[PDB]
Amino acid sequence: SINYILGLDIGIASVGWAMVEIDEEENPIRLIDLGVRVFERAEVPGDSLAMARRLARSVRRLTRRRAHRLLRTRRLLKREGVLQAANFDENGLIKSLPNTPWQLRAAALDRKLTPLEWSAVLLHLIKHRGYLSQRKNETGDFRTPAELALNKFEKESGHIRNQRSDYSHTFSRKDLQAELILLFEKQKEFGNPHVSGGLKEGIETLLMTQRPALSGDAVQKMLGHCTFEPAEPKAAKNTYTAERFIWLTKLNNLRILEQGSERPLTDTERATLMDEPYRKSKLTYAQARKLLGLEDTAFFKGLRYGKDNAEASTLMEMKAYHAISRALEKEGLKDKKSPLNLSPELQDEIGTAFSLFKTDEDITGRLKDRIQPEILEALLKHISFDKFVQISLKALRRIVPLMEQGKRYDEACAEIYGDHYGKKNTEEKIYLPPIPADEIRNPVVLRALSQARKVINGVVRRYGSPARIHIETAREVGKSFKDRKEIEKRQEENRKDREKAAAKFREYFSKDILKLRLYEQQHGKCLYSGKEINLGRLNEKGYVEIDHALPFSRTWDDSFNNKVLVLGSENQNKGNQTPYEYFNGKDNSREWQEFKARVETSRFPRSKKQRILLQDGFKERNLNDTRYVNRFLCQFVADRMRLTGKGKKRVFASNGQITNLLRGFWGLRKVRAENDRHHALDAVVVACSTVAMQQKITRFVRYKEMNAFDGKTIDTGEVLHQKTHFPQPWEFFAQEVMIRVFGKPDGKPEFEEADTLEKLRTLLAEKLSSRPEAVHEYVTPLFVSRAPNRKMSGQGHMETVKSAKRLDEGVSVLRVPLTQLKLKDLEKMVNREREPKLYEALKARLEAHKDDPAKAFAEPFYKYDKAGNRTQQVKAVRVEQVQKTGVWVRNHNGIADNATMVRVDVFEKGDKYYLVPIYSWQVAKGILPDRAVVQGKDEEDWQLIDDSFNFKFSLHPNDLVEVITKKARMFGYFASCHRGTGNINIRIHDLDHKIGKNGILEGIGVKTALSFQKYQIDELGKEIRPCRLKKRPPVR
RNA sequence: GGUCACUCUGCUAUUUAACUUUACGUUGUAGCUCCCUUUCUCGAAAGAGAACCGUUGCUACAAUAAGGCCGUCUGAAAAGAUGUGCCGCAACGCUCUGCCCCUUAAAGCGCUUUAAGGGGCAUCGUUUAU
DNA sequence: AAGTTAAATAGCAGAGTGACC
C-alpha cells in the first residue's frame, strides 16, 4: 500500500507521531501524516494520583482497626464483668465514662478505681498506644508515663497531648506496656475485683498487636522471574548458589593488565582463590595480590586506582555464609575455627526462607522439618535477608557447575539454554499487543505506553504495517574517553564521600549523614538565626530541622540544593516562604544581611548559593518515567510487532541529544510556549533520524570533540557548527515541516494559521514554490487529540471539615489559628461583635506587625478581664466562611467543599441550554441530580428539570465541544463548569498561549447559544464527528 | 575496525508500587473553664445570682472520604454474640454488560430495519483481598 | 514521622554475541 517510517516522541503527557514515505533504498522521500496525542491530567499540588489513593486506603485501615480494637475492648470490659449492660447506651458507648483518664492513670497507682474509672484508663491506654519499634533489635523518680506526663508537662506547658505548635510528649508502646502491667498489679493489691486474669491478657494483646508488614505471598507477589526459566522465581542474593554464581562471574571475568598486555587468571590461580572468601570474612584485592604473588607491574583491570589505597576495597565478600556462620558461633553451636557444617541446598533453603518471609511464624513454617530447632532459633534470633539475583536457583544449579569447570558465563548459558540472552516471547503481530501490565507496577508509565500503542495501532489500521518504527529514548550519544572517565572520577568520589561522612557520623553515637555533612558546609551556624548550634542533640526531632528553603510547596524541589539546616526557633515563624520573603524582602535587616553573609561564606555548592537566594512553574520533573516508557516500548515493539523493513532489526531507538543535534543542523532550533504541536515536529525529525546518523554523530562527539548539545567543535582555529556533514532529508525541510506542524510558514509566528484543508494546501503550494510532493491526499491540518477522562470515581469532598450549624444562612465556620489569621479573616471572626475587646486587640496586634500573623502572634495572646487582669490564652478563633453548597460528612456532623465534578448533563428548552452538575459523592450515594445552574442564586432556587426539558448529552472532562455565539464560534476540549456562573471553560487543542488565558477560554456562556454540540475524535486527531445520546445515563 | 541492542555482575544518580503503625489536624458531643450579646431575679444603689445562645483553654469520647459488605457461634424465627474482619480518590483490558462512532451487504423511502464486522469510552471486567 | 519490601532507568566499569555502517 505505502512504505513509511513511523517516528514517535513520547513524553509523560503526550506522544507526537510522524509518518515519512521512503523509496526502496529506504531513503525518506516525503512527509505523509503527523499528529500529537495528549493524555496529561495528574499531580496533586505534588506527587502521584495512585499515591493519593494509596495513602487514603492506608489511613482507612488505621481508622477501621483502631475503632475495631476499641469496640472489642468495650465487649471485653462487659464479658469480664467490669461493666453490666446498664452502663452501655443504644449505640454501644459507655455511659458517664470519666473524661479524666490521665489523672486516674496516675491516681490508680495509689488507690482502687471505680469500674468506670478503671474502664476509662484501659480504653485510654488502648486508644493511644504509642509507636512500637519495627526494625531488628537483636526514667528515674517518675514510675509511669501518665505521672511524667501530668507532673512535668501540665506544670510547664499547660497541656499533655501534642499540638503542631508545641510538640512535647511521644511515648513508646513498650513504655505504655510497663504502665499497663504496673496498674494491673497496683490495682490487684488495692482490692480491685477486675484484675480478672483473662482481661489482663486480653487488654494486653489488643494493646500490643499489629498485623505484620509482610506475611504469606506478600514478597513472592512483587518478586520478578528468571531470565532463563521464566516459570520459576528469581534466586535470593543471600543464597549459597547465588553468592557462589557472583563470586565465579567476578573470578572468571577478572583480568590482570601487566607492563604491556592483559591476561585471564590461570586454572591454578582460580583454584588458589576459589575457597578464600569462604575461609575469611572477605577477600580484598590486596589479599588476592599476595596469594597469587603477581609482581608490581601487574594491576587489576577496571579497579579505581587514584591517590588512595584502592586495593583495600573488598574483591568478594560471602555475606550470607558468614552471616549464618557468625549467628551459630554467637549462640555457641559452631566453632569460630571450623567451617559451616550445612549443605548447599540447606544454605539455599534458609537464605530464600528469610528473603521471602519475615514473621517467625512464616519462616519456621518453611524451615521446621528441614532444619534442627536449636540452630533454627539461633538464626531466627540474628538473620535478616533481602534482595534477589536475576536468575532462578534452578538455572543457577545448572550454570554454576559449568563455571567451576572453567566456562565463561555466556558459554555456560549457551550450553544449557542456547544463548545468554534470556527466554523472550518473540511473536510478531500486525497490531502491537496489549502491554502485559503484570510486568509494569507504575501506572503513569503504563498509561503512557498504553496510549503510545493506541497511536501505533491507529496508524496501522489507517495505513497498514510500517517499514520501521523510530522511537526517541533518553540515552546520551556515546561520550569521548576524557568525558566518561571524568564522569567515572565524580561517580567514584560520590561513593568515597558517602563513606567519609558515614564514618565521622558513626564516630559520635540516610537523613542522618545529610544532617552532619550539612553542619560542616554552613560553618555550623544555623543559616537564619546565627547561633553556632550545640553540636549534640541530632536526635531531638524538632531541635535542628532539615528545612526546605525554597518551599516544596511552591518549587517542587527535594534535590540536594534546597535544604538549609537551622534550629526550631526560626523554622516556626516562616511558614510557606522563600529565604528572601522570610528575611524581610525589599529593605535590608539583621537576619537578611547575616543570611547574605552565611551564604557568600558557605561551602554549599556554587549552583545552590545562587538557588537559595533568588527573589513559578516546576521546571525539571520525572524524566525517569520517560526513560522507562521509551526503553520498554523499543524492547516490546522489536519483540512482538510485524514490520515491512529491510533488515532483522527494524526498530531504531534514537535519543533526545540526537534529534536536538539534527534539528540544530536542519534549522529548527526554537522555544515551545507556542503550542503542544512541537511534539509532532520532533516525531518527524525522529522518523528521519537513522542508524547511520547515530554512528556518524557518535564518532564525531566521541573521537572528534564535537559538542553533543550544540554540535560545534573548537578548531585552536575558531569554533564551527558541523552542520554541512549532516544534510536534511529533502531541500525544503524547515519550510515543509513547520507549515504542516504549525499551519504557518517558518519565518514568523504572527500570520493567521491555515486552519483548514484548502488554506493549508494553498499555503504549501505557494511557499514551497518548487516541491510538488509536499502537497498530496493525506494533508489535513494538525488538530491535537486529547484523550477523554470518563471515570465516575474521584475524591468525594475536600479534607477540611467545617461546622454546618449555620449552613441555614449560607455560612460554615472553622478555627483559623491566630498564626494564620490575617485582617480579612478577622473581619469574619464570629464573636467579632460578641467580644469587641477581643476584635480590637487582635486588629491592634495585626496592624502593629504589618498584617503578618506569623510574627504578629509569635508572643502568646490573652483575653483580658475588664478589671485589666490577664485570663485565658487564645490559640485559634472561629471564623465565618461563605458556603453556598457542600458535602455532608463525619456522620452528618460537618460539611466540606466538593472535590471532583464527575460530569455535566446538558439540556435544551426553548432554544436555551441548562447545565446540571454531578459530583463524585452524588454518584456514590446514587443521587441522580435534579437542578440546573442559574447564575446568581443558591441551588435551593435553581432550575428544576422535568419531562418539559430536552436532554442533549453528558460532558466529561476533556470531551470535545462546539459552541456558536452570534458573537463568535468556539471549538475545544471541555475543561470546567462554574456553579456560581453556569459557564464552561474550553481548552483549545494546541493550548496556544496567545488565545484565552494560556489556551483556556475562560467563561464561555452557553444559555443563549445558537448551538452547543458535543463531538468525538480519535487518537490521531482525524475522525472528528458529532455524537448525539438518546437516554440520559444513570450514575450507576 | 567502529556503533548499537540485549544477557550477567559491580557501582553512581534517580524513580515507582505494595504493606504495617504512630503522633497530630478537622468537625461533632460532653465536662471543667476564658470572655461576653440579650433576657430574667435580689439589691435603695456600687453590685451579686441565674438562663438560652455565642465562644476561649484543657481533657475525653465519636466520626475521619461521600459510601458498600463479610466471616464465625447461638438461634424455628426475630434477633443476639463475635472478629490481628474487608472494600471505596489508580490504571489497564474488551470474555460478559452498557453507551457512542465507523464500515460492508441486503431490503425498503440524507433515514430505518436486518445481518455481519470493526473501533472508542465506560457506571462492565481485571489487578483486588470474602 | 517510624518501619518491612519489591520494581524500573540514565550513567561508569567488567565479561560476552550479533545486527548494522
Next chain:
DNA sequence: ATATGATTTTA
C-alpha cells in the same frame, strides 16, 4: 490543577 465566590462588562 479544579472549584467556585465576587465583580465587571456586554446585549
Next chain:
DNA sequence: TAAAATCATATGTA
C-alpha cells in the same frame, strides 16, 4: 437586568 467574561482565592501534616 440576565447573560456573559473576568478577577480572585482556597485547597490535610510529621
